[PDB]
Amino acid sequence: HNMSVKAMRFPPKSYNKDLESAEERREREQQDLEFAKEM
């Protein structure tokens, strides 16, 4: 088992992609929150 887990992650490579939810949606959410607060 240990040997198997030692040969586990060799094939994965170049996985720098890390995106959580969005890029410009934070501005829209903040604008909506401010509009709700104003009303």
Q: What sign has the CA pseudo-torsion 33, 34, 37, 38?
A: negative
Q: How far is the CB of 21 from other proteins (least distance, A)?
A: 6
28 binds other proteins (CB under 8 A): no
35 binds other proteins (CB under 8 A): no
In 3D space, the residue among 39, 35, 18 whose CA is nearest the CA of residue 27 turns out to be: 35
How far apart are the C-alpha atoms of 39 and 29, rounded to whole Å? 16
Contacting other proteins (CB under 8 A), which of 3, 5, 8, 36?
A: 36
Residues binding other proteins (CB under 8 A): 18, 20-21, 23, 26, 29-31, 33-34, 36-37
